Design a protein around this ligand. Structure first.
Ligand SMILES: [Mn+2]
Length: 713
């Protein structure tokens, strides 16, 4: 509707930081060499570096003469300035120490949350801005070995249940180097060796190398103790950036990037907009340099009309058409609300009976149990426009008894629904495992935890779940069944909107390189497909093959893309190779492809909690919605380098207000997922989710996927 001024985490840099003369050169590493000489790598392949100092290098090299700051592509200008700021004592090391002067490390259990700042340079107009973004690392104060209780048959479990985000820091080394545990590719089995000789070499390697003094050794042993030969050696690779190193759980500690991911920790890593603003001002005021401004830059944003808030509507059996944003004699009943869909998959026309399962976590008080079972019973009735299983969902014996009991009632059946009520104790893996195991049996499931059950009750009926919550549960289940329970008063100027994502995983006669999720111009999800490919030749996926298989797979599912216009989006920056693949697919099928980067991981932050969007550095930042309940700062979705590809040809475009509106609507298609955090247009979001489901051994019912069933969500 209207404009506004908000503060962002940028601080203008002084032009005077720009170097007098710049030296180019053609050819520790190439990046080190540059950094060592106060310069940067202009060209990775042809090893060309730009230096602000006479290049010192005792090897070969060819001087390519001086160049001026105005001749570098923007990116390089920004990288070069970032590097120069460091020379002035303004780098991630320095300012992170300042941050910790105001936001100190806090420990929770055996874990320590460490605040620090992530810094980059964005060139906006003709100026350069230093982006300072507060982030947190979560390091264990206990060693991996100590964590698993020196039990090997417990260590492997750990590497497995935490495979996705687990990293290991070698606290036994002066450089505190971080590593990534290696796994039996396409498996969750970690690469291990109980070979006592390996464990001895490397354990002895640390000492002879970094602690070769009587006292350095004494501390070492006081600190870590004698080698525990019963421990297996963990094969892993550098986290920076092929090599492969050995780590001893006795000398490493798990480490994680908080943003990349308990409870008391989150209330500490989540910061309100004013807390972030304050902390950067504390840092800035402590910065004794005039090479950068003393205060945060403000920018003019475009607020988003509350009208676009109501383009998604639901309806009942009568003629009530209210948008997604939520006395009468009947309000006394526990009956759920009535949602009359606009479209129901044709698969439901034949299906006979549909088994219903109330799966109750035996560890929930009786009342909570009855509450849940009574709530599910009402949820199912509305579902229609029964077996009760009770087990300790928090033990490998129960989940198995549950699955075992379900498969018993599911043989001969095409579809089943499971309503699970579990404590909050359950790990994500356990929830994921119950849902995946149960889907192997054609059972779609909806989990509801104790939290919602206790704190989301209705003020007029404490024996009934919150009416807001009730509608969202209904939406989630319905969406897992491909039901078009809503209508969108909007039309996309595209034939189809497609979200893809690459995540190579070998599977039973498969080899799947990624996934694609298709939405039609009405904003409905119509097809979800896996992208099967050949065994990777070179160290890089053949996108041409990838995207062709995309076109072919959709045909298999009843959708020809040839001679069609589509908005293809992916989870992240669009790589050159993916572009080629898109040019490839463009010509071969005469497909008009409109694409752009859709970044969710950038450091730019606007210290205001409201729906808005603005232009910064040639990109567009958008906040799809405001945080309504939970504490924290909104994370904008970054859009950039848009382009249209017709007849194998790429033509750079500019992101228009209409473009931003399309992303906005696509982002609000979160399908009643309580706790809105969808920071990606539904197409890319679900694309990402499916790639995961495949990598997690989820059954691929092509029958459901062809109708848009979000069963893996
Ligand atoms: Mn992804």
């Amino acid at each position: 509707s209207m404009k506004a001024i908000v503060v962002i985490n940028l601080v203008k840099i002084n032009k005077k930081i720009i170097p007098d003369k710049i030296y180019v050169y053609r050819l520790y590493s190439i990046y080190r060499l540059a950094y060592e000489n106060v310069g940067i790598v202009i060209d990775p392949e042809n090893l060309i570096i730009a230096t602000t100092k006479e290049l010192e290098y005792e090897g070969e090299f060819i001087p390519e003469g001086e160049i001026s700051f105005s001749e570098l592509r923007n990116d390089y200008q920004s990288k070069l300035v970032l590097r120069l700021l460091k020379e002035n004592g303004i780098g991630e090391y320095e300012l992170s120490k300042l941050l910790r002067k105001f936001r100190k490390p806090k420990t929770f259990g055996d874990y320590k949350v460490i605040p620090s700042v992530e810094m980059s340079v964005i060139k906006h107009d003709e100026d350069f801005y230093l982006v300072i973004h507060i982030i947190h690392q979560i390091q264990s104060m206990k060693t991996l070995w100590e964590l698993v209780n020196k039990d090997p048959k417990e260590l492997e479990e750990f590497l497995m249940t935490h495979k996705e985000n687990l990293m290991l820091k070698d606290i036994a080394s002066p450089l505190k180097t971080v590593y990534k545990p290696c796994f039996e590719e396409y498996t969750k089995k970690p690469k291990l060796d109980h070979n006592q000789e390996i464990v001895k070499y490397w354990y002895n390697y640390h000492i002879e190398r970094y602690w070769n003094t009587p006292e350095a050794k004494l501390e070492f042993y006081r600190k870590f103790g004698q080698v525990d030969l019963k421990q297996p050696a963990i094969l892993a690779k550098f986290a920076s950036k092929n090599y492969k190193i050995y780590l001893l759980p006795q000398l490493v500690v798990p480490t994680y990037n908080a943003e990349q991911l308990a409870k008391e920790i989150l209330e500490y890593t989540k910061l309100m907009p004013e807390e972030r603003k304050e902390l950067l001002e504390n840092i800035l005021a402590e910065v004794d340099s005039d090479i950068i401004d003393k205060s945060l830059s403000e920018i003019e944003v475009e607020k988003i009309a509350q009208e676009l808030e109501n383009k998604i509507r639901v309806r009942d059996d009568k003629g009530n058409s209210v948008p997604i944003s939520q006395l009468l004699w009947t309000n006394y009943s526990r009956k759920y609300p009535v949602i009359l869909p606009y479209e129901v998959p044709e698969k439901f026309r034949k299906i006979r009976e549909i088994p219903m399962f109330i799966i109750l976590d035996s560890g929930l008080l009786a009342d909570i149990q009855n509450f849940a079972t009574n709530e599910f019973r009402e949820l199912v009735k509305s579902m229609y426009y029964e077996k009760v299983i009770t087990e300790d969902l928090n033990s490998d014996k129960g989940i198995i008894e549950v699955v075992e009991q379900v498969s018993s009632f599911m043989k001969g059946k095409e579809l089943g629904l499971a309503f699970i009520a579990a404590r909050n104790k359950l790990s994500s893996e356990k929830f994921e495992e119950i849902k995946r195991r149960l889907f192997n049996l054609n059972v779609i499931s909806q989990v509801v935890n104790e939290d919602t059950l206790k704190n989301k009750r209705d003020k007029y009926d404490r024996n009934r779940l919150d009416l807001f919550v009730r509608h969202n549960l209904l939406f989630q289940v319905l969406s897992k069944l491909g039901v078009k329970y809503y209508v969108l008063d909007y039309r996309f100027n595209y034939d189809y909107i497609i979200g893809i994502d690459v995540a190579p995983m070998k599977r039973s006669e498969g080899y799947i390189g990624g996934s694609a999720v298709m939405f039609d111009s009405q904003g409905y999800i119509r097809k979800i497909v896996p992208i099967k490919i050949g065994e990777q030749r070179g160290e890089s996926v053949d996108m041409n093959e990838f995207f062709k298989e995309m076109v072919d797979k959709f045909k298999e599912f009843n959708i020809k893309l040839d001679n069609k216009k589509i908005l293809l989006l992916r989870d992240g920056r669009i790589t050159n190779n993916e572009e080629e693949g898109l040019k490839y697919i463009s010509e071969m099928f005469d497909i008009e492809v409109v694409t752009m980067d859709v970044i969710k991981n950038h450091p730019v932050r606007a210290f205001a909690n409201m729906k808005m969007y603005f232009n910064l550095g040639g990109a567009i930042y958008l906040i799809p919605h405001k945080l309504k309940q939970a504490k924290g700062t909104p994370i904008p979705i970054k859009l950039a380098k848009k382009r249209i590809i017709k007849n194998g040809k790429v033509e750079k475009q500019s992101i228009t207000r209409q473009d931003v509106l399309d992303i906005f609507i696509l982002t609000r298609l979160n399908y009643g997922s309580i706790s809105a955090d969808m920071r990606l247009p539904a197409p890319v979001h679900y694309a990402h989710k499916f790639a995961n489901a495949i990598r997690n051994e989820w059954k691929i019912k092509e029958e459901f996927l062809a109708e848009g069933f979000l069963y893996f969500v």
